[PDB]
Subunit: 268 residues, 3 copies
Amino acid sequence: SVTANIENVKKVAHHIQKLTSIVPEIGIICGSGLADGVKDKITIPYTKIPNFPQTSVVGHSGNLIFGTLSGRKVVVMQGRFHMYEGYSNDTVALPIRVMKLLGVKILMVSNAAGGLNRSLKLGDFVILKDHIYLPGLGLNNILVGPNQEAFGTRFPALSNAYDRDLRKLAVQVAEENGFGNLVHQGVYVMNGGPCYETPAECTMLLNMGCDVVGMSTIPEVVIARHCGIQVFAVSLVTNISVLDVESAQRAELMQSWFEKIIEKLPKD
Amino acid sequence: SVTANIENVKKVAHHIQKLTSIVPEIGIICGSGLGKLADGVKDKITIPYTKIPNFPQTSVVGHSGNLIFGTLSGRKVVVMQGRFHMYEGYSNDTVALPIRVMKLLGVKILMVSNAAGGLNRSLKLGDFVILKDHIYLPGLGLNNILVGPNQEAFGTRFPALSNAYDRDLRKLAVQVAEENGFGNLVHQGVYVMNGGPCYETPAECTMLLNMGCDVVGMSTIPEVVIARHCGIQVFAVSLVTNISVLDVESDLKPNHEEVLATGAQRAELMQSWFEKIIEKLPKD
Amino acid sequence: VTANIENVKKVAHHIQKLTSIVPEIGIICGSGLGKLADGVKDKITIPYTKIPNFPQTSHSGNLIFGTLSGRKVVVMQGRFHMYEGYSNDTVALPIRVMKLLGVKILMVSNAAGGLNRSLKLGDFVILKDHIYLPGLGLNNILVGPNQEAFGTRFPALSNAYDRDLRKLAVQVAEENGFGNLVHQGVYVMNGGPCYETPAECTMLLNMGCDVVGMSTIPEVVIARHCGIQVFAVSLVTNISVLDVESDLKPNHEEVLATGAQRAELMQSWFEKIIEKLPKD
Ligand SMILES: Nc1nc2c(Cc3cccnc3)c[nH]c2c(=O)[nH]1
Ligand SMILES: Nc1nc2c(Cc3cccnc3)c[nH]c2c(=O)[nH]1
Ligand SMILES: Nc1nc2c(Cc3cccnc3)c[nH]c2c(=O)[nH]1
């Protein structure tokens, strides 16, 4: 890993700009579980980008996808970097800082999560309105280390981290497209991973006021807000958390939802 | 330290197999209270960690740890004498390797004891608390022993911990305690790991109790996580070596000498308990 | 360099060659103790940069020896915070150096957010206990081989915030007419460097925490480990926001400003405490 400072980020941004003329205004991290629908698209493999972080192979590398979507210029990250895999703070931060320099103003991110809130059902959508960053509370915050002042301040507040206006809009779109009944808003808590929670851990997290639980996202969100990118994030409830020791389907819908949100985003 | 990958683990397992012919089916990590257990082992061969290439090395005021093979209640066991605790600064790979070596040697069941403070207010000094679940605070916080590339030869990328403390082994242990006349000492509860090496402040204890924790210690969970990852069945018990202090105004305090002494007091009972459990384990 | 007896001895001896003051009280100036450094009489200033192997800061820090209310003190101007990326050994060494120099009591101030709903801006919250979130999570300053020359493998934190020093500090505030500003409570450490979200604040409050900050606990842990008595106060520089719907937010400039506002009061308070410390 190398440092996500202005110098290195500039270098990566410029290489990318030589491969495409698209200036992205919206960044999309897709998680669980569209990229096609993107029109006039060019695909850049991470492997073709000097110093861009590399992904988990098996046989297949990640891609950066530029193009348009609902008439908006977007860049899509296909292939994420998760802390449980062992990646450094700098590795996880760089792609987000590269988006900033490329022009990105809004980050949209989806993930899969377990449902703690007892009123949640399988397949529900839970818009993040706040989070609890357990690793960050415990000295593994993605921002630990010298601050890169070119991107943001030493002590960031996370006041309106999940932009309330984007949340309102997303609810409105779901409502008028007839699935407002699947959509909730709640608190996402990050478990460092890679283990699923024990029933005791789930019970503790619920009593902590958490609604859903996952292993991702918060580090990106922290980096995004740090450099002034607006954030929208949703969890797909892919399972109901088990609280007692004694104890691809929604993809099309989710894609359509993001597509219809982007179409209504206020454009400068 | 060497990565706990299949290559390195294989190498260590093979060296050990050259020093003994015992194929262990039960693995025992002696904590507080299992000091005497090591002795009762019959037909035993002792292998010092120092004689095992690439096996992690221990601390014990100079004296090295040992691996002890032999039989116990007619069952073939391997006993780890000397553990690796995270607060000592050991790596994830160091702590994981011994457990993965057991897997390749044939181990099917891991039995582990430890000492812990009593958070649940109904607990008494010297009580036995069988773990039925845990809260892995370091794991929640990105210091999970499994962080890093997954070793697929041993297990999956995203393990569930559904029945981590095998319910059948727990039921059996309760039965053995009951019929041998000490069922009144035995409880079941949730163990929470504090990374250590400090004892908890009263405020921390109060928080952990309200979190739903019954006992608190500094060990064990990492081994249990590695064991479950590679499909070994787990049985674990805490000896309550002290009552957690919840009030800043108190003058009671955790004393490591008193912790060691309680362990030594219940040691004979605990050894007998493990010995009688092993004797009733369903044998393939 | 490892904070072992050999390295600490080396640093202690170098310092002792630059000054004859044997300190009995150690002061870590946080938010509010800016002015305290000045009031120190007969003072010699030693810059960290002149001390071989002493940790380096992020203008350099200084070690200030001298007297204060007739007592011999050493003042650390410039701290080492974990969020900056410093090692356990780096944070621990200065405190271990104090031990060898003669320090018996550590006084520390910091700035914190107010979780307890009864707290007001500019209040003083004497620490009577703490919750060490990084410590619970395997990032305890003491992780690693134990340095036996300084203390035991498994330290208790029974009376970490000496009850007698707390009682005294309350008495001093009371008789000097600001007893109404002073509370006692539980301090929780957030590793940092981010301010807490409303959800995190809500969780921390329900955990039983009164104030939240990013410092102090590691030094306290090292101090208690080697048997130094500890006194620590938080200045409430902001009220924690518990609601996502609010438009109030933590502002570092307002944090700095509140600190500077109460600085004179805080200095006077530490000065009048030291004056009443039982002297061997
Ligand atoms: N911590 C946690 N994460 C998840 C996820 C996210 C995930 C996990 C593994 C593979 N792919 C995605 C889904 N459910 C949960 C959960 O319950 N807890
Ligand atoms: N955190 C915590 N740990 C323990 C232990 C574990 C132990 C092992 C060896 C020596 N000393 C302690 C026992 N009791 C406690 C406890 O109360 N809290
Ligand atoms: N975590 C947290 N810390 C603080 C502080 C301390 C501080 C020191 C340096 C810069 N900024 C803040 C003051 N208030 C808070 C807070 O609310 N939360």
